[PDB]
Structure formats: C-alpha cells, structure tokens
Amino acid sequence: MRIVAADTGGAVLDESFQPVGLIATVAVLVEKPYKTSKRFLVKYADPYNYDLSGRQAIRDEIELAIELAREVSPDVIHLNSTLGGIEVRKLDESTIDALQISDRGKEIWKELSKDLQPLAKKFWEETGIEIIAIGKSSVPVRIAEIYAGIFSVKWALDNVGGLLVGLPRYMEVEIKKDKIIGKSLDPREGGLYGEVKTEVPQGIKWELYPNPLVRRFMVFEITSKS
Amino acid sequence: MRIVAADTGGAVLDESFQPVGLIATVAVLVEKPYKTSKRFLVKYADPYNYDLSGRQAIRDEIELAIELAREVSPDVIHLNSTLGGIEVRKLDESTIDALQISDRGKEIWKELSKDLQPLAKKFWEETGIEIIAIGKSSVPVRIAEIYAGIFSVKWALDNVGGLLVGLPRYMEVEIKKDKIIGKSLDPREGGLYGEVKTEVPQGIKWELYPNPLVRRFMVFEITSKS
Amino acid sequence: MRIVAADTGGAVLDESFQPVGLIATVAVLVEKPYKTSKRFLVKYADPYNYDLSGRQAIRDEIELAIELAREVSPDVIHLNSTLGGIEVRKLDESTIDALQISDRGKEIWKELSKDLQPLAKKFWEETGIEIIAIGKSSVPVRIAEIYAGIFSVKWALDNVGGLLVGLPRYMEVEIKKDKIIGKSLDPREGGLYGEVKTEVPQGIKWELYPNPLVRRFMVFEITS
DNA sequence: TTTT
DNA sequence: TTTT
DNA sequence: TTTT
Ligand SMILES: [Mg+2]
Ligand SMILES: [Mg+2]
C-alpha cells in the first residue's frame, strides 16, 4: 500500500508556553515498512498572523496532499480528521449527521464540506483515489505530524534572539551537522521517524524539554549566544 | 496470588490490512512477579472460516481457562472482558443493566450469559474459584494476549507463498532458531513478555512493521523466497 | 516559569493487592527544564486509618502547596484536579455548573468550594499567586506524583515485618546506598524523575513488579 | 463487550 | 473535528 | 474529581 497523508503541527509559544500560531503543513508519501517518509512537501504558515480558531490547516492539508498525490499516485490519501474513515467526496449534510462525533464537530464539517467535498470529488473523478477522514488511526498521518515537528524546528532555526517551538505530541528532535531528525517518543508506535536536510545556523544554542503546562508535549527552545 | 487468564488474538490480514479471522486462543498461569507465564495452553481457530462478529472467542477463552485451571488450581480466573471485575456466575439480566458499559455491551452480555453464567456457576460450585470479567485492568490477561501474538506467529510459520499476521496491540516478536519471543512495546506495563518453543521453517523471510491503518499495532509478514 | 504543585499517592496494599490507604502527600517546586524537583515538602498520612472516599487528599495537597509556595514564592500553584485550569479562587457553584465534568465531580467540588475557595482567595490577596485546577495536563503535578511514590517507599523503608506499596501510575523506584530514585516509565513524558536521600536500613530485601490487578501500576514489596 |  |  |  502507498499512502499520502498530511498534517499541520508545531507552534510558536510565548514565554508562558501559550501558543501563538501554527508553523508547518506537511504532506508525506509513506510506503512499506510504514515507519518514515522519503518524499514530502511543506507549506509554512505565518505563526504571528495565524487564526488558531481555526481550520485553515485542514484546507491547506487537503490541498498539499492532492498536490503530492498528483506526482506520486498513491492508493489513498489520509486526512487528519477522526471521522471513522469516511470518504470526503461522500461528505454531505446527511452523512455528517450520521457520524459519531460531537455536535460542534458536525457543524464544523458541514461548513468545511462546502469546499472540501467538491475538491475530493473532482480528484476521485480524475484518479479513483479516495481522500479519507481517518485521523488518529493512521500511521501515515502520524508520520506527517512528526515531519511537521521537524519542519517547525527547521523554520525556527531559519527564522531566529530566541524562539520557543511547541512540538506535536510526544516526539523529540535531534540536530545534526546537515539535518534534523525527528522521532516519536512512543515505542508503542513501532519506531516512527523522519529526517530533513538543512543547514544549521551558527551563533545559536538549543534545548529540548517538557512543556510544563501540556504533559507529553516537548518544547524545542532556541537561544542566541549573543 | 496465582492467576489463570485467557485471551484470543492475532489475525490473518489481507493485503490491504483488513482482518480475515482470528488465530490463537491461549490460557496462561501467571504467578509472582507477574511478568510472564511458564504454563499455558493454546487452541487455534481457523481464520479463513471465522466469524469476526460471532464472538466464539470468549466462549473459547472461558473453556480453555477452565481447562487449565483444573490442572493448576489458581486463586482466580481472569476473563478478558472489561466489566469492572464482576463474577461471571453472577451475570444475569439484572446485574448486566447495572454495569457501567455500553448498551451494545449490555445486549452482547445478556446473550453470552445464557451459556457462560451456568458454566462459571458450575465451576465455582466444584472449586470455589471465581471467573471474573476484569479485562483491560488485568496483567494476566495482557500476558495471555502477548502469548496469543506469539502463537499466531507460530501458526503462520507452520501454515505458510505469503502471510500477514496482525498482532495484538503494541507488541513485537523476535524469531530465534528454536523459539519465538514476544514482548510488550509499552514500558509502562513493567516488562511483560512470553516465550514459545518452535521449529522455524526454511525458505521464508519475515518482517515486523507498523500496520498503517491501525496505529500502535504491528504486522508480522511472512514471504516466500519462492 | 516557577511552579509549585502537589499530589497524594502511594498506597498500602493487603495481600490480595487491595489498597488500604494512601501514604504520602508531596509538594514540589519545579523550574526549567521541568523534569524533576530539587525543593519539596512531604506530609505522611496514616494509611491504616485513611478514608479513600474522603477527599482529604486534595485538602492536604492545597495546604502543603501553599506552605511551600510561601517559602519559594512561585509564579503559580498547580492543583491535581483536572478542571481545565480554572482558578480555585473563582470556584463558586455557578462556575462549577459550567465545568465540562461528570455530575459526581460537580457535587464533590461544590462541597470542596466551601473551604478551598476562600483559602485560594485569601492566598491570592496575600501574594497574587493563583491556584489552578489543571491536574493531568501538568508536568509539575506528575513530578509531585513521582515524588509521592518515592516518599511512599521511604515510608516503607522506615516502617518495615513486611509491606506491599502500590505506587502511582507507571513509575519505578531504585534504591541506592543512600537514596531513592523514582522515574516515570512513560518515555512520552520526556524523562521525569525524582530523588530523595534517606538512610537505608540493614536486613531487608525488596522487589518491584507489576500489580497483577491494575495494569501499568507497579508494586514495591519489602520484607525483613 | 471483543477484534486488527 | 483540530492545536500546544 | 481522586486512588491502587
Ligand atoms: Mg496532529
Ligand atoms: Mg496522582
């Protein structure tokens, strides 16, 4: 099976660990053994002019996933929304009410349907590829999330006297001479990881530590040596 | 305390990772320090003629657990159903509605009661040993589950041009010349493991990797060198 | 950020692994990098005369947290009750009705409000420090919990003809010549740990293993 | 309720 | 539904 | 709500 998935993750935090805005939207191609991705795309947001509430992310995600899918022709696209695996081209007012989600979730998706359903429909017509709202269940979506963490740190290195990056849940990053490696901290996930080439700037220091206000989320903090 | 527990686990998957049927039912004796089992029984199902909605699994589990219990005389039997630890001999329509479980769960157990309650009652009459529906809370149940994973792999090695075995949640297997070792991938469980003797066939290769459709579950795939 | 948090944890178990009563209430000061605590206080309960339904735990916790806070002057106090981070000084029946929790949870806290809310208000007046009900989301709270586990083992060392101590969730302890080290078993938490100096008595054996009745909780067993 |  |  |  060959899967394209997408996710948005990584946030700039203020000094009291409150998120300001999100950083990276990433689409990944994932193939057996489903532990990493070697082909991916990134779109960076502007975290300082981001509306955290909300849902530009999912629109950016589906667009980027389709863009990558047109190049690599996967079997399926996984979208990061836990709706039971329903095909997005089949999302209408009727099918959304039948969904086992909260009443806010239903109204959010009734609005999102207006743009996303025709998009998925046109893409399925062209290719036969479904876009499914699978979310938390998907390993490719979790690999996309790890890459969103990595690219958030890349963005921070490229855009830093100090920056706090809130990473996606329970993942770590490691800085190497010419690359950033991201890994899940959950061994139950079976060793999921990512790697992105980058040049690491001089004159800065970094540390990774637990976000004290959000258990199981880590903070990557960059500080200037000057 | 000395505990007998049982579980059914391991599934044949098709090439799109959809389960076809379950493989192994295992009963274990677990004693201090409650990390493994040295005395156990296995019953193999036929996964290609399995009713995944049938729920023959729990009938097989209680039967195999009672069979092992008659040999080793434990303090208690742990059954894999998370009902709050109620004794199975006490399961009637009255006690089932009082349980804090789903209405689907209540309707399943009202039907299961008709066979299982008399079975547990007669075993308690004979021995004084309770069969309790403890499920997810039980470490002996998790150890039975790990052994079901190991035995599913043994079954696959013995019955394979290629096979996909979906393992129980977050566990790995290791193949040695003369045995299979199974371990939980969750360090929070305190190091649960199992080991089964077997002959490993020639002319085949194997791989263990994440199920892309079911996060925190692994696939053990066997392929012929053919 | 500088944080005081508190928790009650660790339990005496009987021979069928049933809890009898809780042991340690611990207040910790937590600072960057938020992985441990070097400054903490402990209050021991009497586990053989403990009411597990009583919610004396949270009253002991807030008192000890305040006691430590007066000494180390933190930015905020984290209380181990998952109410979304609401300020305790702002807890009246109306705000409790609005909380996204169970109806039992609501009835418990309407009763707790009667004593704890005036305490938080007066403390906020004195220092400007909030006491927020953040609970499961707080790392300092988990560090307090790990320290409760450590102190429960210290209690066991101090009181052992044989004892079974049920530790807080997924943590381990190690006894060294002059200290007890506690660690989270969950690597997702990022390496949380604690350490307490104590004199280790002679003539004893100990073992750590899974509670067979409560998955992901360990038992510390000590014998003379 | 259980199963991957 | 999603975000730290 | 919390506890093993
Ligand atoms: Mg995500
Ligand atoms: Mg606690």
XYZ file of C-alpha atoms (C1' of nucleotides) and ligand atoms in Angstrom:
690
model
C 0.000 0.000 0.000
C 1.177 3.525 -0.847
C -0.355 6.334 1.144
C -0.211 10.101 1.032
C -1.080 11.827 4.320
C -0.998 15.409 5.567
C -0.956 17.283 8.880
C -0.315 20.718 10.336
C 1.746 20.937 13.537
C 4.324 22.853 15.524
C 3.522 26.122 17.254
C 5.405 29.214 18.328
C 4.929 29.584 22.096
C 5.269 32.690 24.231
C 7.298 32.779 27.457
C 4.376 31.344 29.428
C 4.010 28.473 26.956
C 0.825 29.790 25.328
C 0.650 29.017 21.596
C 0.699 31.999 19.241
C 0.136 30.207 15.932
C 0.977 27.055 13.968
C 4.033 26.705 11.721
C 4.186 23.796 9.247
C 1.751 21.948 6.992
C 3.339 18.785 5.574
C 2.244 16.120 3.054
C 4.113 12.830 3.071
C 4.281 9.723 0.905
C 4.506 6.597 3.047
C 5.326 3.100 1.803
C 6.193 -0.223 3.449
C 7.518 -0.625 6.189
C 5.472 2.489 7.111
C 7.953 3.976 9.566
C 9.070 7.090 7.725
C 8.731 9.086 4.521
C 11.353 9.834 1.880
C 9.146 12.099 -0.293
C 7.320 15.066 1.182
C 6.166 18.675 0.770
C 5.936 21.512 3.252
C 3.960 24.751 3.440
C 4.983 27.180 6.186
C 2.355 29.318 7.841
C 2.925 32.690 9.438
C 2.527 31.828 13.132
C 2.397 35.536 14.049
C -0.663 36.108 11.870
C -2.432 32.807 12.293
C -6.003 32.269 13.390
C -5.756 29.288 15.701
C -9.556 29.156 15.667
C -9.407 27.761 13.105
C -9.395 25.316 10.142
C -7.180 26.970 7.584
C -4.993 23.994 8.451
C -7.306 21.308 7.105
C -7.801 23.260 3.864
C -4.026 23.626 3.457
C -3.614 19.936 4.302
C -6.000 18.575 1.684
C -4.507 20.879 -0.986
C -0.959 19.856 -0.245
C -1.891 16.156 -0.069
C -3.536 16.390 -3.509
C -0.502 18.220 -4.888
C 1.799 15.431 -3.687
C -0.704 12.721 -4.761
C -0.664 14.057 -8.358
C 3.101 13.381 -8.506
C 3.383 10.030 -6.700
C -0.056 8.439 -7.416
C -0.855 6.785 -4.065
C -3.535 4.185 -3.384
C -5.318 6.500 -0.962
C -4.995 9.870 0.798
C -5.296 10.011 4.639
C -6.649 13.276 6.040
C -6.062 14.133 9.735
C -9.653 14.141 10.943
C -11.027 11.292 13.035
C -14.370 10.702 11.314
C -14.264 6.908 11.035
C -12.587 6.747 7.641
C -15.422 8.229 5.592
C -14.544 9.345 2.062
C -14.519 13.119 1.846
C -16.228 13.087 -1.584
C -19.189 11.468 0.213
C -19.484 14.186 2.873
C -22.917 15.778 2.639
C -25.345 17.119 5.235
C -26.872 13.662 5.631
C -23.696 11.614 6.069
C -22.242 14.138 8.534
C -25.238 13.855 10.915
C -24.814 10.070 10.889
C -21.196 10.489 12.044
C -20.364 9.539 15.625
C -18.749 12.873 16.526
C -19.652 15.852 18.732
C -22.308 18.348 17.670
C -19.635 21.036 17.173
C -17.678 18.603 15.015
C -20.756 18.060 12.863
C -21.375 21.768 12.331
C -17.671 22.411 11.649
C -17.657 19.762 8.925
C -20.968 20.884 7.436
C -19.164 24.163 6.774
C -15.916 22.527 5.623
C -17.909 20.245 3.294
C -18.843 23.235 1.176
C -15.258 23.465 -0.183
C -13.684 20.085 0.625
C -16.346 17.737 -0.762
C -16.171 19.142 -4.335
C -12.375 19.088 -4.142
C -12.260 15.404 -3.154
C -14.957 14.584 -5.705
C -13.044 16.147 -8.579
C -9.846 14.379 -7.553
C -11.572 10.983 -7.256
C -13.179 11.508 -10.673
C -9.726 12.136 -12.124
C -7.853 9.279 -10.475
C -10.125 6.947 -8.481
C -8.148 7.899 -5.353
C -10.188 8.433 -2.186
C -9.404 11.051 0.435
C -10.425 9.549 3.772
C -11.018 11.215 7.118
C -9.153 8.659 9.191
C -7.147 10.841 11.609
C -5.711 9.298 14.805
C -5.827 5.751 13.476
C -3.431 6.412 10.576
C 0.299 5.769 10.824
C 0.967 7.929 7.713
C -0.848 10.844 9.406
C 1.378 10.356 12.488
C 4.478 10.385 10.207
C 3.177 13.620 8.639
C 2.844 15.014 12.155
C 6.424 14.086 13.020
C 7.599 15.878 9.847
C 5.516 18.898 10.808
C 7.529 18.911 14.063
C 10.832 18.646 12.172
C 9.910 21.368 9.692
C 8.765 23.592 12.575
C 12.233 23.314 14.075
C 13.753 23.940 10.625
C 11.596 27.055 10.370
C 12.715 28.172 13.846
C 16.406 27.701 13.022
C 15.932 29.628 9.771
C 13.906 32.427 11.373
C 15.539 33.017 14.744
C 17.304 36.441 19.959
C 15.169 33.447 20.948
C 12.306 31.113 19.937
C 10.124 28.510 21.651
C 8.720 25.762 19.444
C 5.924 23.613 20.802
C 6.296 20.253 19.054
C 3.480 17.824 18.187
C 2.699 15.251 20.860
C 5.437 13.089 22.366
C 8.136 13.488 19.778
C 11.755 14.573 20.000
C 14.124 16.191 17.530
C 17.852 15.868 17.189
C 20.099 18.352 15.449
C 22.898 17.063 13.274
C 25.520 18.873 11.189
C 23.380 18.865 7.995
C 19.993 17.564 9.109
C 17.231 17.403 11.679
C 15.929 14.035 12.821
C 12.517 13.657 14.414
C 11.353 10.571 16.331
C 8.203 9.517 18.151
C 8.829 9.095 21.875
C 6.125 6.395 21.980
C 7.676 2.989 21.443
C 4.129 1.547 21.093
C 4.094 3.205 17.645
C 6.833 0.880 16.449
C 9.710 3.335 15.682
C 8.259 6.180 13.591
C 10.769 8.829 12.480
C 11.658 11.494 9.936
C 14.729 13.256 8.591
C 15.088 16.589 6.813
C 18.214 18.177 5.303
C 19.035 21.672 6.482
C 21.945 23.973 7.196
C 22.244 24.665 10.882
C 22.963 28.306 11.623
C 25.856 29.419 13.826
C 25.602 31.566 16.943
C 22.633 29.781 18.495
C 22.011 27.223 21.213
C 19.166 24.829 21.698
C 17.495 22.577 24.229
C 14.558 20.176 24.276
C 12.455 19.791 27.445
C 8.901 19.008 28.611
C 6.249 21.693 28.189
C 5.244 22.121 31.847
C 1.629 23.062 31.011
C 0.966 20.358 28.419
C 2.079 16.910 29.587
C 3.691 14.630 26.938
C 4.420 17.605 24.645
C 8.032 18.791 24.315
C 9.425 22.284 23.738
C 12.381 22.959 21.449
C 13.929 26.196 22.614
C 16.460 28.238 20.658
C 18.529 30.946 22.301
C 21.052 33.352 20.826
C 24.663 33.173 22.036
C 24.791 36.958 21.620
C -1.776 -14.914 44.140
C -1.825 -17.419 41.292
C -3.999 -16.464 38.353
C -5.289 -18.181 35.242
C -6.219 -15.864 32.369
C -7.195 -16.280 28.728
C -7.373 -14.244 25.543
C -7.847 -14.593 21.796
C -5.668 -12.553 19.482
C -3.746 -12.403 16.245
C -5.489 -12.082 12.893
C -4.804 -13.084 9.340
C -4.853 -9.848 7.335
C -5.397 -9.454 3.610
C -3.021 -7.332 1.508
C -4.981 -4.177 2.385
C -4.562 -4.956 6.101
C -8.212 -5.933 6.609
C -8.629 -8.745 9.159
C -9.956 -12.046 7.806
C -10.251 -14.008 11.063
C -8.600 -14.626 14.438
C -5.931 -17.253 15.064
C -4.954 -18.180 18.631
C -6.759 -18.624 21.945
C -4.346 -19.021 24.835
C -4.808 -19.722 28.542
C -1.968 -18.835 30.911
C -0.990 -19.433 34.531
C 0.603 -16.303 35.959
C 2.429 -16.161 39.321
C 4.666 -13.586 41.036
C 6.362 -11.443 39.660
C 3.521 -11.354 37.071
C 5.652 -10.622 34.006
C 5.365 -13.878 32.020
C 3.871 -17.389 32.055
C 5.642 -20.739 32.137
C 2.499 -22.888 31.901
C -0.025 -22.352 29.152
C -2.414 -23.894 26.632
C -3.292 -22.896 23.088
C -6.231 -23.536 20.799
C -6.001 -22.470 17.142
C -9.022 -21.231 15.269
C -9.469 -21.472 11.505
C -9.016 -17.844 10.468
C -10.403 -18.472 6.953
C -13.674 -19.734 8.417
C -14.043 -17.318 11.288
C -16.988 -15.140 12.202
C -15.408 -11.902 13.428
C -18.863 -10.857 14.630
C -19.527 -14.328 16.060
C -17.844 -13.968 19.475
C -16.846 -17.603 19.664
C -13.609 -16.109 21.039
C -14.857 -15.539 24.609
C -16.578 -18.962 24.727
C -13.221 -20.479 23.667
C -11.385 -18.378 26.260
C -13.526 -19.359 29.276
C -13.417 -23.006 28.238
C -9.617 -23.078 27.829
C -9.167 -21.088 31.063
C -11.304 -23.620 32.960
C -9.337 -26.465 31.374
C -6.023 -25.008 32.570
C -7.499 -24.050 35.981
C -8.490 -27.664 36.659
C -4.807 -28.601 36.298
C -3.101 -25.768 38.201
C -5.794 -24.771 40.775
C -5.407 -20.968 40.690
C -6.864 -18.443 43.135
C -8.960 -16.802 40.413
C -9.639 -16.818 36.670
C -9.356 -13.553 34.736
C -11.603 -13.286 31.682
C -10.908 -10.669 29.015
C -13.988 -8.505 29.226
C -13.839 -5.146 30.947
C -16.918 -5.323 33.138
C -15.469 -3.980 36.391
C -14.407 -7.357 37.796
C -17.865 -8.852 38.290
C -18.052 -12.637 38.816
C -19.389 -14.407 35.723
C -21.550 -16.743 37.862
C -23.427 -13.619 38.969
C -24.172 -12.336 35.444
C -27.922 -12.179 34.860
C -30.073 -9.564 33.109
C -30.402 -7.646 36.373
C -26.671 -7.302 37.074
C -25.800 -6.589 33.430
C -28.018 -3.476 33.210
C -26.424 -2.127 36.405
C -22.962 -2.329 34.749
C -21.299 0.884 33.531
C -20.876 -0.350 29.962
C -22.317 0.470 26.542
C -25.816 -0.647 25.608
C -24.270 -2.729 22.843
C -22.083 -4.314 25.534
C -25.128 -4.968 27.700
C -27.004 -6.670 24.859
C -23.924 -8.773 23.964
C -23.533 -9.999 27.528
C -27.202 -10.767 28.097
C -26.890 -13.285 25.254
C -23.457 -14.527 26.381
C -24.796 -15.021 29.940
C -27.069 -17.850 28.814
C -24.091 -20.163 28.319
C -21.293 -18.577 30.326
C -23.132 -17.950 33.612
C -24.094 -21.621 34.105
C -20.548 -22.614 33.158
C -18.962 -20.288 35.720
C -21.556 -21.293 38.340
C -20.791 -24.996 37.995
C -17.036 -24.365 38.113
C -17.410 -22.254 41.263
C -19.584 -24.965 42.832
C -16.842 -27.512 42.173
C -13.853 -25.485 43.311
C -14.816 -22.137 44.868
C -12.835 -20.352 42.114
C -14.435 -17.231 40.613
C -14.206 -16.301 36.912
C -14.096 -12.523 36.840
C -14.682 -10.175 33.916
C -11.750 -7.853 34.568
C -10.432 -7.362 31.013
C -8.122 -4.382 30.410
C -7.220 -3.950 34.068
C -5.608 -7.405 34.272
C -1.904 -8.100 33.765
C -2.507 -11.870 33.405
C -4.954 -11.054 30.567
C -2.287 -8.916 28.835
C 0.205 -11.808 29.224
C -2.319 -14.199 27.619
C -2.726 -11.615 24.827
C 1.059 -11.494 24.245
C 1.120 -15.304 24.080
C -1.757 -15.198 21.562
C 0.517 -12.975 19.428
C 3.408 -15.399 19.756
C 1.233 -18.420 18.954
C -0.284 -16.606 15.970
C 3.229 -16.183 14.602
C 3.961 -19.853 15.306
C 0.781 -20.750 13.444
C 1.758 -18.563 10.490
C 5.265 -20.023 10.277
C 3.725 -23.504 10.376
C 0.949 -22.843 7.832
C 2.512 -20.660 5.171
C 3.515 -18.216 -0.555
C 2.996 -15.420 1.988
C 1.016 -14.464 5.118
C 0.195 -11.248 7.007
C -0.389 -11.628 10.742
C -1.916 -8.665 12.547
C -0.615 -8.835 16.129
C -2.405 -7.793 19.333
C -1.810 -4.177 20.385
C 1.776 -2.819 20.750
C 3.759 -5.996 20.958
C 6.739 -7.281 18.993
C 8.004 -10.763 18.268
C 11.571 -11.977 17.894
C 12.442 -15.081 15.935
C 15.205 -17.320 17.214
C 16.352 -20.666 15.793
C 14.234 -22.656 18.246
C 11.762 -20.240 19.741
C 9.650 -17.143 19.362
C 9.865 -14.363 21.941
C 7.035 -11.880 22.410
C 7.293 -8.606 24.327
C 5.009 -5.699 25.077
C 6.181 -2.469 23.438
C 4.713 -0.458 26.313
C 7.354 0.049 29.054
C 4.546 1.310 31.304
C 3.407 -2.310 31.670
C 6.629 -3.135 33.532
C 8.226 -5.601 31.115
C 5.649 -8.186 30.094
C 6.862 -10.993 27.829
C 6.384 -14.551 26.645
C 8.356 -17.321 25.010
C 7.297 -20.376 22.978
C 9.476 -23.224 21.646
C 9.131 -23.975 17.925
C 10.992 -25.079 14.774
C 11.479 -22.226 12.310
C 10.900 -23.289 8.696
C 13.335 -22.705 5.855
C 12.677 -20.932 2.558
C 10.838 -17.973 4.071
C 11.596 -14.385 5.114
C 9.870 -12.236 7.665
C 9.440 -8.621 8.612
C 7.754 -6.824 11.514
C 6.366 -3.342 10.882
C 3.557 -0.921 11.807
C 0.043 -1.587 10.473
C -0.502 1.675 8.605
C -4.244 1.635 9.173
C -4.175 0.830 12.890
C -1.669 2.886 14.861
C 0.208 1.026 17.697
C -0.498 -2.375 16.132
C 2.306 -4.276 14.328
C 2.181 -6.655 11.337
C 4.330 -9.771 11.098
C 4.668 -10.560 7.409
C 5.985 -13.787 6.007
C 7.135 -14.003 2.379
C 8.448 -16.967 0.420
C 11.889 -16.797 -1.131
C 9.877 -18.678 -3.799
C 8.381 29.691 34.870
C 8.455 28.600 38.529
C 5.709 26.231 39.678
C 4.545 24.665 42.920
C 2.396 21.546 42.544
C 1.174 18.910 44.971
C -0.173 15.372 44.914
C -1.138 12.455 47.123
C -0.064 8.985 46.019
C 1.298 5.601 47.018
C -0.900 3.130 48.896
C -0.510 0.313 51.397
C -1.934 -2.846 49.811
C -3.163 -6.012 51.516
C -2.071 -9.465 50.343
C -4.732 -9.506 47.600
C -3.363 -6.178 46.250
C -6.335 -4.236 47.584
C -5.463 -0.689 48.701
C -5.866 0.095 52.412
C -4.962 3.775 52.471
C -2.722 6.403 50.901
C 0.710 7.281 52.254
C 2.399 10.447 51.032
C 1.309 13.951 50.156
C 4.102 15.849 48.437
C 4.507 19.469 47.357
C 7.248 20.260 44.820
C 8.866 23.325 43.333
C 9.514 22.812 39.626
C 11.681 25.001 37.399
C 13.235 24.711 33.914
C 13.888 22.176 32.337
C 10.809 20.861 34.197
C 11.997 17.255 34.596
C 12.466 16.958 38.360
C 12.359 18.914 41.612
C 15.181 19.911 43.962
C 12.942 21.563 46.550
C 9.966 19.748 48.057
C 7.900 19.010 51.185
C 6.182 15.810 52.331
C 3.278 15.003 54.645
C 2.609 11.396 55.614
C -0.918 10.125 56.179
C -1.881 7.161 58.328
C -2.735 4.527 55.685
C -4.277 2.237 58.296
C -6.816 4.895 59.164
C -7.455 6.516 55.813
C -10.772 7.208 54.093
C -10.257 6.597 50.367
C -13.634 8.186 49.638
C -12.891 11.176 51.814
C -11.036 13.643 49.572
C -8.839 14.628 52.473
C -6.140 14.223 49.829
C -6.939 17.415 47.926
C -7.285 19.427 51.150
C -3.888 18.178 52.331
C -2.466 18.952 48.888
C -3.591 22.579 48.678
C -2.384 23.269 52.226
C 1.077 21.842 51.581
C 1.357 23.585 48.212
C 0.590 26.913 49.870
C 3.069 26.154 52.659
C 5.858 25.532 50.120
C 4.752 28.478 47.974
C 5.143 30.887 50.892
C 8.780 29.805 51.175
C 9.841 29.702 47.496
C 7.416 32.270 46.008
C 6.418 30.544 42.712
C 4.512 32.077 39.792
C 1.569 29.692 40.152
C 0.272 26.681 42.089
C -0.869 23.598 40.168
C -3.532 21.513 41.896
C -4.130 17.886 40.932
C -7.736 18.145 39.783
C -8.480 18.247 36.063
C -10.948 21.126 35.799
C -9.449 22.836 32.756
C -7.094 25.115 34.671
C -9.771 27.243 36.301
C -8.667 29.424 39.222
C -9.734 27.917 42.564
C -10.479 31.402 43.925
C -13.074 31.682 41.150
C -14.836 28.414 42.022
C -18.421 29.047 43.092
C -21.446 26.877 42.329
C -22.139 28.756 39.086
C -18.679 28.195 37.584
C -18.816 24.565 38.724
C -22.052 24.064 36.774
C -20.231 25.246 33.655
C -17.308 22.835 34.070
C -17.137 20.066 31.479
C -17.096 17.257 34.065
C -19.243 14.451 35.497
C -22.138 15.220 37.835
C -20.405 13.460 40.727
C -17.333 15.569 40.017
C -19.549 18.632 40.255
C -21.095 17.575 43.586
C -17.667 16.839 45.092
C -16.346 20.277 44.200
C -19.417 22.221 45.313
C -18.676 20.721 48.721
C -14.947 21.428 48.387
C -15.675 25.034 47.333
C -16.970 25.755 50.833
C -13.454 25.610 52.304
C -10.951 25.738 49.446
C -12.306 28.733 47.529
C -11.988 31.169 50.478
C -8.472 29.826 51.079
C -7.420 30.477 47.481
C -8.951 33.972 47.527
C -7.090 34.946 50.697
C -3.859 33.479 49.344
C -4.276 35.344 46.051
C -4.860 38.548 48.039
C -1.639 37.994 50.008
C 0.719 37.002 47.192
C -1.017 37.347 43.824
C -0.400 33.654 43.213
C -3.211 31.691 41.572
C -4.100 28.123 42.464
C -5.385 26.488 39.281
C -7.112 23.128 38.893
C -5.067 21.795 35.988
C -4.432 18.189 37.040
C -3.489 15.677 34.344
C -2.201 18.323 31.980
C 0.503 19.491 34.438
C 4.064 18.158 34.397
C 4.826 19.624 37.849
C 1.807 17.644 39.139
C 3.258 14.430 37.662
C 6.637 15.254 39.243
C 4.812 15.653 42.581
C 3.184 12.276 41.917
C 6.527 10.600 41.260
C 7.800 12.137 44.491
C 4.763 10.716 46.332
C 5.830 7.316 45.022
C 9.393 7.890 46.194
C 8.258 9.056 49.629
C 5.876 6.079 49.929
C 8.883 3.793 49.521
C 10.808 5.866 52.085
C 7.810 5.362 54.362
C 8.006 1.607 53.699
C 11.741 1.545 54.457
C 11.098 3.444 57.676
C 8.250 1.202 58.817
C 9.179 -2.318 57.696
C 7.537 -7.046 59.270
C 6.587 -6.781 55.586
C 4.801 -4.308 53.344
C 3.192 -4.013 49.888
C 3.199 -0.491 48.487
C 1.141 0.315 45.395
C 2.982 3.047 43.518
C 1.435 5.809 41.427
C 0.850 5.026 37.748
C 3.764 3.706 35.629
C 6.708 4.718 37.709
C 9.618 2.694 39.031
C 11.891 3.139 42.008
C 15.500 2.212 42.567
C 17.167 2.014 45.977
C 20.815 3.015 46.183
C 23.091 3.096 49.221
C 21.881 6.487 50.444
C 18.941 7.480 48.273
C 15.778 6.526 46.458
C 15.378 7.326 42.773
C 11.938 7.393 41.120
C 11.336 7.558 37.352
C 8.358 7.701 35.026
C 8.118 4.517 32.949
C 6.450 6.559 30.172
C 9.079 7.842 27.723
C 6.341 10.063 26.245
C 6.614 12.253 29.344
C 10.149 13.247 28.402
C 12.218 11.852 31.282
C 10.559 12.832 34.552
C 12.327 11.700 37.712
C 12.837 12.382 41.411
C 15.407 11.606 44.056
C 15.288 11.541 47.858
C 18.146 10.973 50.301
C 17.389 8.540 53.120
C 19.238 6.009 55.234
C 18.564 2.502 54.015
C 18.109 0.047 56.880
C 20.038 -3.218 57.005
C 18.482 -6.678 56.989
C 15.889 -6.057 54.293
C 15.037 -7.265 50.814
C 12.852 -5.523 48.273
C 11.277 -6.272 44.923
C 9.390 -4.272 42.303
C 6.849 -5.915 39.970
C 3.539 -5.318 38.148
C 0.342 -5.145 40.187
C -1.467 -8.076 38.573
C -4.894 -6.481 39.166
C -4.046 -2.967 37.966
C -2.200 -2.871 34.645
C 0.580 -0.213 34.348
C 0.887 0.158 38.145
C 3.906 -1.346 39.948
C 4.131 -2.833 43.455
C 7.018 -2.239 45.825
C 7.343 -5.164 48.224
C 9.700 -5.009 51.184
C 10.403 -7.816 53.707
C 12.523 -8.127 56.862
C -18.275 -6.126 25.244
C -14.247 -8.012 21.837
C -11.001 -7.789 17.195
C -6.789 -5.652 13.635
C -13.393 17.546 14.312
C -8.191 20.161 15.173
C -3.873 22.932 18.010
C 0.428 23.442 22.103
C -12.987 14.970 40.914
C -9.154 11.405 43.082
C -6.864 6.346 44.481
C -4.113 1.245 43.630
Mg -1.523 16.391 14.613
Mg -1.658 11.375 41.307
